[PDB]
Amino acid sequence: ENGEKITSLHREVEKVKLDQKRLDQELDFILSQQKELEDLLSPLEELVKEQS
């Protein structure tokens, strides 16, 4: 009777870890959008001190 619960415990646990992984690598990547979109707001600091 307990063993069964154990089962849908295992279940739903590794689908939680499918979860987190994912959200994990997600946060890297939203994170990388933040390193790129930054270097290059400037190198947009050319294009704008040139105009100047």
Partner: protein, 50 residues
């Protein structure tokens, strides 16, 4: 015949020993389990809600 009762009561009693033996052996370990899985299930709900 009274060799005899020396043995039969003896094999019977030998058996009561095992009966005692099982009696000695009894559960709390078991009772413990439902409590824990009931508990682990709950933490899983946490993590999930998190």
């Amino acid at each position: 015949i009274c060799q005899d009762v020396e043995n039969l009561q003896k094999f019977v009693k030998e058996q009561k020993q095992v009966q005692e033996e099982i009696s000695r052996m009894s559960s709390k370990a078991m009772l413990k389990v439902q409590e824990d899985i009931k508990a682990l299930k709950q933490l899983l709900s946490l993590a999930a809600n998190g």
